[PDB]
Design an enzyme around this catalytic site. Sequence first.
Site, mmCIF file in Angstrom:
data_model
loop_
_atom_site.group_PDB
_atom_site.id
_atom_site.type_symbol
_atom_site.label_atom_id
_atom_site.label_comp_id
_atom_site.label_asym_id
_atom_site.label_seq_id
_atom_site.Cartn_x
_atom_site.Cartn_y
_atom_site.Cartn_z
ATOM 1 C CD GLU A 3 11.838 10.295 -0.433
ATOM 2 O OE1 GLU A 3 12.564 10.250 0.313
ATOM 3 O OE2 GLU A 3 10.406 10.209 -0.357
ATOM 4 C CE1 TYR A 26 6.569 9.867 0.192
ATOM 5 C CE2 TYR A 26 5.807 8.294 0.112
ATOM 6 C CZ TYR A 26 6.250 8.619 -0.664
ATOM 7 O OH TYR A 26 7.277 8.537 -1.637
ATOM 8 C CG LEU A 51 -1.770 1.134 1.805
ATOM 9 C CD1 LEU A 51 -2.642 1.379 -0.229
ATOM 10 C CD2 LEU A 51 -2.413 1.100 2.561
ATOM 11 C CB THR A 96 1.288 5.512 2.729
ATOM 12 O OG1 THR A 96 2.693 5.773 2.898
ATOM 13 C CG2 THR A 96 0.791 4.787 3.611
ATOM 14 C CD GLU A 119 -16.135 1.558 -1.556
ATOM 15 O OE1 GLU A 119 -15.466 2.128 -0.243
ATOM 16 O OE2 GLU A 119 -16.958 2.172 -1.298
ATOM 17 N NE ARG A 120 -10.569 5.382 -5.276
ATOM 18 C CZ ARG A 120 -11.191 6.285 -4.390
ATOM 19 N NH1 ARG A 120 -12.736 5.552 -5.136
ATOM 20 N NH2 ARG A 120 -11.572 6.953 -4.026
ATOM 21 C CB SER A 141 3.091 6.343 -9.820
ATOM 22 O OG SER A 141 3.800 7.708 -9.467
ATOM 23 N N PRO A 142 1.897 2.671 -10.063
ATOM 24 C CG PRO A 142 1.063 1.131 -8.039
ATOM 25 C CD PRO A 142 2.127 2.711 -8.392
ATOM 26 C CE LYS A 154 -3.628 7.865 -1.580
ATOM 27 N NZ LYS A 154 -4.440 8.519 -2.322
HETATM 28 N N1 LIG Z 1 10.183 7.417 -4.836
HETATM 29 C C1 LIG Z 1 9.338 7.550 -5.173
HETATM 30 O O1 LIG Z 1 9.907 9.222 -6.325
HETATM 31 C C2 LIG Z 1 7.648 7.983 -5.247
HETATM 32 C C3 LIG Z 1 7.399 8.888 -6.309
HETATM 33 C C4 LIG Z 1 6.040 8.682 -6.589
HETATM 34 C C5 LIG Z 1 4.326 7.906 -5.214
HETATM 35 N N2 LIG Z 1 5.426 6.499 -4.681
HETATM 36 C C6 LIG Z 1 5.275 5.324 -3.861
HETATM 37 O O2 LIG Z 1 3.809 5.008 -4.534
HETATM 38 C C7 LIG Z 1 3.377 4.727 -3.594
HETATM 39 C C8 LIG Z 1 2.623 4.330 -5.388
HETATM 40 O O3 LIG Z 1 1.996 5.681 -6.141
HETATM 41 P P1 LIG Z 1 1.134 7.084 -6.351
HETATM 42 O O4 LIG Z 1 0.503 7.495 -5.005
HETATM 43 O O5 LIG Z 1 2.179 8.360 -6.774
HETATM 44 O O6 LIG Z 1 0.638 6.640 -7.353
HETATM 45 P P2 LIG Z 1 -0.536 5.345 -7.572
HETATM 46 O O7 LIG Z 1 -1.047 4.566 -6.611
HETATM 47 O O8 LIG Z 1 -0.598 4.833 -9.510
HETATM 48 O O9 LIG Z 1 -2.307 5.978 -7.865
HETATM 49 C C9 LIG Z 1 -2.778 6.474 -7.334
HETATM 50 C C10 LIG Z 1 -4.188 7.459 -7.730
HETATM 51 O O10 LIG Z 1 -5.046 6.499 -7.457
HETATM 52 C C11 LIG Z 1 -6.505 6.617 -7.072
HETATM 53 N N3 LIG Z 1 -6.550 4.729 -6.948
HETATM 54 C C12 LIG Z 1 -6.350 3.985 -6.588
HETATM 55 N N4 LIG Z 1 -6.839 2.487 -6.280
HETATM 56 C C13 LIG Z 1 -7.635 2.756 -7.687
HETATM 57 C C14 LIG Z 1 -8.327 2.371 -8.293
HETATM 58 N N5 LIG Z 1 -8.548 1.191 -8.225
HETATM 59 N N6 LIG Z 1 -9.816 2.494 -9.578
HETATM 60 C C15 LIG Z 1 -9.576 4.183 -9.269
HETATM 61 N N7 LIG Z 1 -8.460 5.042 -8.822
HETATM 62 C C16 LIG Z 1 -7.614 5.017 -7.927
HETATM 63 C C17 LIG Z 1 -5.937 7.163 -5.503
HETATM 64 O O11 LIG Z 1 -7.171 7.468 -5.182
HETATM 65 P P3 LIG Z 1 -7.622 7.094 -3.786
HETATM 66 O O12 LIG Z 1 -6.696 7.323 -2.778
HETATM 67 O O13 LIG Z 1 -8.580 8.236 -3.103
HETATM 68 O O14 LIG Z 1 -8.162 5.704 -4.066
HETATM 69 C C18 LIG Z 1 -4.689 8.002 -5.928
HETATM 70 O O15 LIG Z 1 -5.765 9.110 -6.326
HETATM 71 C C19 LIG Z 1 2.786 6.869 -3.409
HETATM 72 O O16 LIG Z 1 1.988 6.728 -3.422
HETATM 73 C C20 LIG Z 1 4.163 6.402 -2.803
HETATM 74 O O17 LIG Z 1 4.227 5.255 -1.652
HETATM 75 C C21 LIG Z 1 7.574 6.919 -4.549
#
Ligand SMILES: NC(=O)c1ccc[n+]([C@@H]2O[C@H](COP(=O)([O-])OP(=O)(O)OC[C@H]3O[C@@H](n4cnc5c(N)ncnc54)[C@H](OP(=O)(O)O)[C@@H]3O)[C@@H](O)[C@H]2O)c1
Length: 325
Positions: free
Chosen positions: A119, A57, A22, A24, A277-278, A219-220, A272
């Site tokens: 990071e 974060y 998950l 965050t 539900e998601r 950002s999967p 994330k």
């Molecule tokens: N190391 C780095 O440079 C770096 C950079 C970016 C991110 N990360 C890490 O990667 C994690 C994942 O990436 P991310 O948060 O950027 O993006 P993400 O997981 O690709 O997408 C998240 C977005 O999608 C929504 N979402 C989640 N499940 C969904 C679903 N089943 N259907 C439709 N929309 C959905 C979320 O809203 P809701 O919460 O309202 O569901 C949120 O707006 C981060 O939270 C962090 O822990 C690391």
Amino acid sequence: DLSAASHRIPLSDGNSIPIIGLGTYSEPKSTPKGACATSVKVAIDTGYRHIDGAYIYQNEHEVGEAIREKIAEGKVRREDIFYCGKLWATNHVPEMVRPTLERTLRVLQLDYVDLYIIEVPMAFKPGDEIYPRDENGKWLYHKSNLCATWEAMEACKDAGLVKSLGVSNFNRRQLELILNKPGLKHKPVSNQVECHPYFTQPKLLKFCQQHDIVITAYSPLGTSRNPIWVNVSSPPLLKDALLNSLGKRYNKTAAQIVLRFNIQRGVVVIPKSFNLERIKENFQIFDFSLTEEEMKDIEALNKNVRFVELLMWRDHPEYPFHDEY
Ligand SMILES: NC(=O)c1ccc[n+]([C@@H]2O[C@H](COP(=O)([O-])OP(=O)(O)OC[C@H]3O[C@@H](n4cnc5c(N)ncnc54)[C@H](OP(=O)(O)O)[C@@H]3O)[C@@H](O)[C@H]2O)c1
């Protein structure tokens, strides 16, 4: 093979990592206090055993609150949970690495983290600001020394404060700098980079595999599409025609299809969601599989265009995305 109950894959240092976790990260400005804690608890109840976070974060204390509560009630034991923390650009000075990790351990109120990663490969001016800038907005850059910073990370593992060491947003060159470092003690076991059907990371993935480095896809799901870091002009990943058509085929959402795609290829995914539900939806990816043809068609969606370009730092000596991979 992979199941809801058992989906951990091996890391090169003998440890293992749950293939789904998950994420965050959530904009501090538009995120209610406690949302992270609630989400981590729901995630653990759902079956997640991997949580990805970072001190910057601003909610690492919420992550710890949730993990500790679940351990206290017997939902899981500490050894069953995998937490990844990160060392920000402003804490790359060698003497600052351990104190920075110790802060996170104190914030989480845990004795160790399962994975601690640099990071970003870029070093910023140390201080009380994650984004060091002057009155001119000119970014205050600091001389990076990846190998020296890595040595400091290695000492943290030697002390037992962290089980595995890794990096994030590192390109081939930068990975080689560590892999070929004289007197290398702990090779990086993971590289967390943007990865999904529109940016499949073919070359970086192959390189990492040659060194037993597991890629973790941040950002999967294609990001939250925040204009600060993403161009809202680009077509949304989850609206892709093929992804949605394949979703209809398996009665799964495009999000589930994209997550299954990466885990089926050995790529860890950390989607994330702070929505009940998601959070559950994203975890339901072990009751089906994609055929070889479907996997090939999805990988073919690769645009070699990333959502997170970090263009504001393209002038930093350690910019990771200037090179091909
Ligand atoms: N190391 C780095 O440079 C770096 C950079 C970016 C991110 N990360 C890490 O990667 C994690 C994942 O990436 P991310 O948060 O950027 O993006 P993400 O997981 O690709 O997408 C998240 C977005 O999608 C929504 N979402 C989640 N499940 C969904 C679903 N089943 N259907 C439709 N929309 C959905 C979320 O809203 P809701 O919460 O309202 O569901 C949120 O707006 C981060 O939270 C962090 O822990 C690391």
